[PDB]
């Protein structure tokens, strides 16, 4: 599982 | 920035 937030 | 890898 990958999560990115900017 | 936030990143998660599980």
């Amino acid at each position: 599982e990958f999560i990115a937030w900017l």
Side-chain angles (χ1 to χ4, degrees), chain A:
Chain A
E1 173 164 357
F2 174 73
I3 301 293
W5 168 81
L6 303 182

